[PDB]
Structure 1
Amino acid sequence: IIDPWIRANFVQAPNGEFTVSPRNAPGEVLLNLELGPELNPYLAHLARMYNGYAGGMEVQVMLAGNAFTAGKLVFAAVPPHFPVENLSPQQITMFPHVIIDVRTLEPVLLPLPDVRNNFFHYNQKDDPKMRIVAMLYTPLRSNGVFTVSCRVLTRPSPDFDFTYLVPPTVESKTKPFTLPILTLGELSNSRFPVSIDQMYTSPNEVISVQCQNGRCTLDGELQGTTQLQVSGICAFKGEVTAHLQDNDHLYNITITNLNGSPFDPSEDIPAPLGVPDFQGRVFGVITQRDKQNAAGQSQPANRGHDAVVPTYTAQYTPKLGQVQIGTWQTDDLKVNQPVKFTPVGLNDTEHFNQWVVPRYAGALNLNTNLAPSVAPVFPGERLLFFRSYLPLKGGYGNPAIDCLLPQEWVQHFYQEAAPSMSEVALVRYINPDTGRALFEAKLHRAGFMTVSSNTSAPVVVPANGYFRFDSWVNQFYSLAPMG
């Protein structure tokens, strides 16, 4: 079935690119890949039309170093159900292996067999398979800071074959990860219902964030209070159940879900979906349309006013089903009638902290079912944000919400739901008139981006640039410096 061009020529793997520097030590696994069609884009296209597969492959490795470096790498094949975590460089020579110097101008070849105890593999129902492992065999001396770039190419062996025809692109587990082609003038903020202004790198005191809107993994798993509508970010609806007099007016509100269903407090969610996930005074518009008809040509009556929702206080308890608003010196809200809130911005920058999570069940309770905190782990990297600027009702300031993902990428990751081949995907930011990349970043499975920078500053880009998915990499991959 396979075209004889495919069987004769090597094509770059989707898990292909890696690095080796003299900051690496012999004993660290630089490359750990698994057998299967995902190592070849033509086979990855043909795999979406069949049910199963069997067969081994052939791997070519290119190294790019000069005549001023020294050292040896080793590439070996490791069978299924063998532990890989405590391999030493002495043990890896007891496998089918190849040892190469870094000064060479010629690529390296290794066959990767398909050792199995059955007739074929299924695309669903995964099972362990053969792997290829690379570690540094002798220490790397770049005498006369020099990072060496490396690529992996594959092609099928003469015994590789596909088994049963299924309808194309229906069966999952064969879908490739794609990233949508949208510019920053077309993306939207995911933690507040405005549009994205620029890209920005994190401050020196921000090393770990935990937000609850705009959290979604690359596999398409919504987390926290993340929903899909832009009109539902920082918005809620329900009925007024209470009234209070103060300097102001208070209007306690029992909230429901945004589809109209009542909110069950025992669900595995921190709060109803789409409530604000930061501390501050959210400014917006509250509105009522009545449920009974006063005469009025057989129509209901309507109210709409300005309101403030403070989320740092003891009465912002959306997990318990309550929220309290405020109208400055206005009393026109009927009790026992439905309300809807539409967010506009903030009132002032008082008690405004964007990286502090509210107490969703109030005081005397702990937040449960929270999305996990994210952070960079590689030495010398920081978080990358998408920054918008918000309106204020009064006072002085220039407030800003940062987000981890654009809302359109959340939507695309939900609709596609492709499997993740590794822990980190390498992306680049392409200038489409020339083809030159501007910077490169890491995109993690949990849904956040890190760059290699020393400053907290806005990122100056052209107007038509976009991100492009290039490869799946591992944790040892060393990004080029952004500045």
Structure 2
Amino acid sequence: SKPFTLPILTLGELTNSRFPLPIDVLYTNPNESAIVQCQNGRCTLDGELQGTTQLLPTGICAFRGKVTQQVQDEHRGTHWNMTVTNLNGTPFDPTEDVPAPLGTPDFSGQIYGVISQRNTLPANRAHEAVIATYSPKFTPKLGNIQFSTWETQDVSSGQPTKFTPVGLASVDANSHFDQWTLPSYSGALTLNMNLAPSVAPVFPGECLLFFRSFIPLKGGYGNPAIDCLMPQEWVQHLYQESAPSLSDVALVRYVNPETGRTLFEAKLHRNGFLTVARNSAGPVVAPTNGYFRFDSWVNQFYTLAPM
């Protein structure tokens, strides 16, 4: 049986699997009221990608496709309908057993980025753009979405189009940012399908442990963050290794390699998420050289040393 391993990467060598951001801090929030069911950064410990998760760091919250036409919308700006393909350019098959094209954003909000086009030497253009994932026009599972520009005219129809995500447009009330609210991938009155399962601690005194990144803002007030269950490099590692899971729960230790000492231990669950025994919210303050190391397979009854 191929031994289970995690990569040896400090926090400063990890990136977020739900938005293209470095990992800033480890983070807990025991009093979280929302169901945690993100769809990017989802991978079982034996290497099965789930939800909308794919391997490319450049694919996370990215889109590829073609503008069909300018469209009208209640949102501020100029609006454009875009058909979307798979990120590799092949047509998206809405009957595939996935919630949405892989890489599709997995949260409610106004995602800010840049739309660029290279015509079929070719002419080019790029503009700032916003994709409102809560919008009735956000229907990636049907093969098309809508973005808005401040630019009023220079977006070409029928030309290859890329969305590069950068951050959020706003986190004010009207912008509906909620990292745990899933988009309706096929539109408002339709049920999402093929979702990666929700995650939660089962043991008393335990809470989820997140890899947190702070996400840029185009304007307004706020310090928004995106929490992922595992960094993108862990997704990539687990997929490569495909090591069989010998129980439902791996014990892992966060180690200081300089001193060799364990800072804390955590449960790494089969479906691909961490829990710790902690009763507070906020960052985990840990030396920069720290990283998780697999210790042993345990079970759901194992009692974690309190953080």
Normalised TM-score (structure 1): 0.61
What is the CA deviation profile of residues 356-403 of structure 1, one whole-angstrom value per residue up to 9, with x for unaligned ones?
A: 111001022111111111111101110000101011001111000000
1:206, CA displacement in angstroms?
A: 3.9
Work out the number of aligned pairs and report it.
302
Distance in 2 (CA, whole Å) between partners of 1:435 and 1:240 is 54
Contact 1:236 1:341 in 2 (8 A): yes
Contact 2:30 2:279 in 1 (8 A): no
Q: Does 1:332 align with 2:154?
A: yes
Contact 1:207 1:382 in 2 (8 A): no
Distance in 2 (CA, whole Å) between partners of 1:423 and 1:207 is 24
1:308 maps to which residue? 130
Distance in 1 (CA, whole Å) between partners of 2:254 and 2:267 is 11
SS of corresponding position for 1:409: helix
What is the CA deviation profile of residues 301-351 of structure 1, one whole-angstrom value per residue up to 9, with x for unaligned ones?
A: 111111000001100000111100101242101112111110000010021
What is the CA deviation profile of residues 432-483 of structure 1, one whole-angstrom value per residue up to 9, with x for unaligned ones?
A: 222221111100000000001110021111111111111111111111111x
Normalised TM-score (structure 2): 0.96
Q: Does 1:382 align with 2:207?
A: yes
**Bigger mean CA deviation after superposition, 274-283 or 322-331:** 322-331
What is the CA deviation profile of residues 59-81 of structure 1, one whole-angstrom value per residue up to 9, with x for unaligned ones?
A: xxxxxxxxxxxxxxxxxxxxxxx
Distance in 2 (CA, whole Å) between partners of 1:480 and 1:207 is 26
1:10 maps to which residue? none
Q: Does 1:418 align with 2:243?
A: yes
Distance in 2 (CA, whole Å) between partners of 1:178 and 1:228 is 18
Contact 1:207 1:375 in 2 (8 A): no
SS of corresponding position for 1:343: strand
What is the CA deviation profile of residues 99-130 of structure 1, one whole-angstrom value per residue up to 9, with x for unaligned ones?
A: xxxxxxxxxxxxxxxxxxxxxxxxxxxxxxxx
2:29 maps to which residue? 202
What is the CA deviation profile of residues 207-228 of structure 1, one whole-angstrom value per residue up to 9, with x for unaligned ones?
A: 7410000000000000000000
2:118 maps to which residue? 289
1:163 maps to which residue? none
Report % sequence identity.
71
The unaligned stretches of length 5 or more in structure 1 are: 1-173, 292-298
1:179, CA displacement in angstroms?
A: 1.3
Distance in 1 (CA, whole Å) between partners of 2:182 and 2:21 is 20
Contact 1:423 1:445 in 2 (8 A): yes
Distance in 2 (CA, whole Å) between partners of 1:330 and 1:389 is 30
Equivalent in 102, 106, 118 of residue 273 of structure 1: 102
Distance in 2 (CA, whole Å) between partners of 1:457 and 1:226 is 26
The unaligned stretches of length 5 or more in structure 2 are: none
SS of corresponding position for 2:96: coil
RCO higher in structure (CA 8 A, sep ≥6):
2
1:364 maps to which residue? 189
2:167 maps to which residue? 345
* Misfit runs of 4+, over 3 Å: none
Contact 1:207 1:376 in 2 (8 A): no
